[model samples]
Target: LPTWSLDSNGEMRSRLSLSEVLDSGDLMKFAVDKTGCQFLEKAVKGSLTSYQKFQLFEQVIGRKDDFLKLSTNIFGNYLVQSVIGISLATNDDGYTKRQEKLKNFISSQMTDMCLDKFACYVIQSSLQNMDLSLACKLVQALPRDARLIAICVDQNANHVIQKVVAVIPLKNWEFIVDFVATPEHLRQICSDKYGCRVVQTIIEKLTADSMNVDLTSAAQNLRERALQRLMTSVTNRCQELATNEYANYIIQHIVSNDDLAVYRECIIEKCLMRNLLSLSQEKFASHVVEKAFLHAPLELLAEMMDEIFDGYIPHPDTGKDALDIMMFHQFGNYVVQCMLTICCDAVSGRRQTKEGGYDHAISFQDWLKKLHSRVTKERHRLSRFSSGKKMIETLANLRS
Candidate 1:
């Protein structure tokens, strides 16, 4: 009956203006209705105007406890399905005070909740609703009792940390690391693309005072362990490739961040080789390789090839025939050529630039096109070799 009544513009407008809907009793009843559920989804998806959504957020803040209890079911069912769309549609420009009210409301929940589930949900919602910087500040403001630390170690906990580090500076990495001690979970949090970037920032900040007596060796040890753990995680996550693609990505991340000290290079190289070998055995290697090659360097790629082929490979298989092994060599050479093409583009980009600069750097669109053309041309040449068939099959599977 209410749904039908609300469907009519005159009735809807009248009801919307009524003081009763502004009350907790009517709002909760409506929020529980199927029509209200639909309305909530529409509001999130931008169908509702900013004023309407802001009003809704205000109403929900007024029923903060009830909201926490219901939002998981309600939003997971009807709202998160179109999260990006809803977020893009919902304009919050004029709702700063209302948004801050919601932020403080969630912040209160974060401190009040003793259970991991509640802490997790409160942290998540706070991140979603507030800006990353404000969200980090809110997290810092909350009580960091042991139960909350335990909650921060959940696998999904990385989502909260991601937002935290995005807004917080590198000098404060210890603030987060202090709150979480579960190595496995810390590895998960730091191994991510965004997470890795943040960790790199922290590492960069530490380079000057790394050996200072004030900084415990334990701290440096933990930093190294975190980086190693990240490498292991990536290898485990993306081990399936016809070639050393994903492994190269790990190597590139390390090289870019490790700073080229000869003393550190030995340990870094050995650790990287171990990670690459581990990745070579996984089902996700091919996917990892395609993803990684975008960020890999040609010189390091050659190094990877030599380590895998020259250092790892033993006596050539006489059974499959020496020719087969040689064909594998030819295939490696082909891959190297593709890598070289990438290098050439890097060179060309530098060369073609004006003394000042182009109106725009080569767009990623044009760069990708050139890179694809080069790799495709090289792959065509390699197709004549025996190992090329294997490469082609792997490529086909990737496309399929």
Candidate 2:
């Protein structure tokens, strides 16, 4: 049998048309082999008629193990994806009948396929492109434990879970939140590298009304309590997570989300209040501190600024205090800028002189005087680097 190839115009050319191959009953065997799978995919996408595509689907679904094997294969997976795409795109009189059969076939096999690397993409594509009823059926058929496993462990699988969480009717969220509600489960989900993203998606969906997933009363109540538990646990662990490379994003997400604002003070008190100076010195945690500075209440913001500036006593030998040290370091300069911005805001308000002319005027003036002295002494010494240059410029801006 002669092999097929695309002509100069990008159309497929072959001694035997795809219809011929399908009639030959050899297409199924060709599709099962690694080298021949691409040919089958092209036939499905570009050559086969709806009835031919339906025939191919019937052949594949008739053999469950073969379908699963093909779905999990690197080359074979594309064929499966194309088949699904074709089924969903065709609107012939027979399309619904064929679609129902394909939907049932996928629903029965989705859970296992979701855990397979190559096949998970096919599963997600089906969920994304199939009829809404079929898509919901696929999601509903996912076993509870399987859904958790997908979110908690499988990297590709989690996206499918997120899509389901985003599109599935609100009543379904009850089970999802319940599955993740326990302290043990929340800890694992919020701490795992990939699992954290799934949790983040859940929170984002719950807060966004435009997703249009109607929540059951039970799901709504569960979500509120579940989010409360999740926020409390995240606050208690914010310090540890703030320093983590992966987990820090979850903390950032919580602090940045307005819906979760009620937990802001607890996060500020527990994570930022006493640890502001130290957190400013870290590579990852500094970001959490910066976020807090941006969103924190005025009183907590003042306390954080105080902690940062007051902790800047000079080194006994080097004469460089924490302030000078941080201003020169890559990550620390950001925290310094946050503090400086607060100071600048305070001083500028004082210029208006409405009432008390800003109560912290004296303290900020003193700190600025000290900072100016240090920068002037180190001007040439620190000015060589970009971070140092920025820090000096920020201080000069504040002073003016």
Candidate 3:
């Protein structure tokens, strides 16, 4: 009996001849076997010619169940990837014919492959390395209705969808955008942990594509409207989504990127007008609030500070006010830092400074005075916690 072992370089070495394995009628079984998989992996990369590889592929294609079974197998998946790698490397006209045959076989089973844990990798490999036309065909073949939406939420299959979005042409994006056309539909997608990634990818790609106008004038106009509508739908839900743990990232995505700046004012308006302080204290929404603080205009930034300080008087006994409360919070601390940086930047014309490290102009000094008074009154109560104590030190140092 022939055996396989790993050489020093970690490549597989087989004592048995390649002819013996191929001559055996049960090629699928050998490919799926642990040692046999190593042997086959080496052969695909080392021994098989393009023609011979095609022949072996045809033989495996007939055994559909076994092929898919191998695709999901721990070692078997690598063998399948190796085959795909080979197909992509072949340059002969005959290789093209064989490649089509391989693509056709894989395309027919893509949905099942995408859902399968092991097979999903093979599908992703094809998307990454195969011809774009074939890749688009595979992507277009994915059920665009609820099942496709289901895949977007799937842990394994969502990666395949991301690849499709990244590699396929922009014209193909409409199919994906249609899946979440309405605010309700968008909410459902953004709320899902895995599905949110797909939505974010779509938004990012559309934002990138919108910067360049390559299509016909009419097509360009239509694309603009579509992009506008897509962003409007998402931004319309900004306030509601900004608090969701999963969905908040999508909102952050919109606000943090300049291409999507059209939605920035809407997000800032919603946060300040409705729940600025509450959001600043929220665990997840605080991140979006911080982003708004950094990106919003100076007027909005001043209003944000005003909102935080509004009606907030430091209590001598309780030591709790909006500033102390946020400074004490893990998430809210960053919001305070953003506020301080914005204030210092406005006054000193500097971008960033160390704690108590920058020269405070008169305007900056006055703002610090208000903060200093609040911390001074609550010094006794604030010193009880480390975060509050740190805030006290920061305020005292900035005053000096």
Candidate 4:
């Protein structure tokens, strides 16, 4: 048996040199074997040569019909992707003549490739590997806003759309800043299961992080424009976005970015703080509030806790208590747990901060004791519910 044979009869059909594998004369057979496909992928990644291209990509892609089959095969598709990325990037005039032919065929049909299960990755690699001028023109040539939105919502295609934003300049997607330019378009995309990721990818590519490192002034304008679109969306319906099952996560993404702190503060001060108890009790919105509590600075936490928790507690028997309501409710219990963590960090943890000895106008400790009194007073009432018991049990753990 030849050394490259994958035959199952117990003989060593194992490792061979890259040249030895190429000499086998049967590229399709090896490109399908688990071990064989892996070998091809690794070898192809190491800079292609003229003869190697004729042996590898040209042989595996034997017929035009085979390109589709190989590009979609579970194992063969990976090898196809290796060829797609490197072949497109090969600069040698030796076969310009040829790998250029291969790359152009792949690029021309890239839209269909973008929607394929295994082949979408080929499209992604093509976008990353293609020359910038050509890639930018490809993005510009793509279908308009509605068609682009359709692409963003597909399981396979969305990854390509995401890849496009990450690679191409914000030109076509500077038009992307347009689809999302209006509040309606922004809200529509931010709420889809797959659509949310494309929105996120656009944000990541245009962030202050990207700006701080390698962005041109033009890129800065794109990030600035995207920021305004998002800001307007949140300001228009801060509560609606926070309360959404999917959109709230996008809000949390916004909140976690330090450069976007102004939006975070705006949401808290304008919406969540004013509707503190209600927002905390909601299912999805509560998670966003938890993010706020987790990321908000000491002063901000102090502002919410002081204004809301410390405001008043006239009579417990009257029974409209915000703290007790939070402790006992389904979603609200988590909000209380996170609040406890924040409070513990403020009162105990910050006291030891290296910078300053620490001070708060109302005494951060004064409020934990306030929380302490309530949790103790309502021990039995709270423990009646499972989540309530979990909240107080956590309180004890944090207080220590």
Off by over 4 Å in 1: 1-18, 37-59, 73-105, 111-137, 141-158, 168-173, 177-183, 187-268, 273-400
Error of 1 at 92 (Å): 18
Q: For model 4, name the residue pairs that clash.
A: 95-98, 170-174, 173-176
Q: Relative to the unseen true structure, what is the C-alpha lDDT of residue 18 in candidate 3, on a scale of 0 to 100?
A: 59
Off by over 4 Å in 2: 1-13, 32-36, 46-50, 89-111, 143-151, 209-226, 311-331, 341-386, 397-400
lDDT of 3 by residue, 333-393 (tens): 7777677656645555554323245333554556656766776776787688765676676
- The residue ranges of model 4 lying beyond 4 angstroms of the native Cα positions read 1-69, 73-76, 85-89, 94-108, 210-212, 297-300, 310-317, 350-358, 361-363, 385-400
| Residue 43, candidate 3: C-alpha displacement in angstroms | 1.8
Kindly provide the TM-score of model 3 when superposed on the true structure, using C-alpha atoms: 0.81
Best candidate per lDDT, number? 3
Clashes of 4: 3
Q: Provide the global lDDT of candidate 1 against the true structure.
A: 0.44
Of candidates 4 and 2, the better by TM-score: 4
C-alpha lDDT values of all predictions: 0.44, 0.70, 0.71, 0.71
Could you give candidate 1's per-residue lDDT for residues 1-400 as a string of tens digits?
2553365453343344323353334555555566655655554544555544545555554356655554444333233223323333456674455456555656666544423333445455555555656655566664555544444434444355555544443334445544333454435434454444444443344343434334556755665554444434433432221224223333344444434232134433444444543433344332333223333333344455444334444446544322223334523334433333444444456323222343222432344344345336556655776545554554444344
TM-score of each: 0.46, 0.75, 0.81, 0.76
RMSD of each: 11.8, 5.4, 5.5, 5.1
Better of 1 and 4 by TM-score: 4
Error of 3 at 237 (Å): 1.7
Error of 2 at 53 (Å): 4.0
Estimate candidate 1's RMSD in Å: 11.8
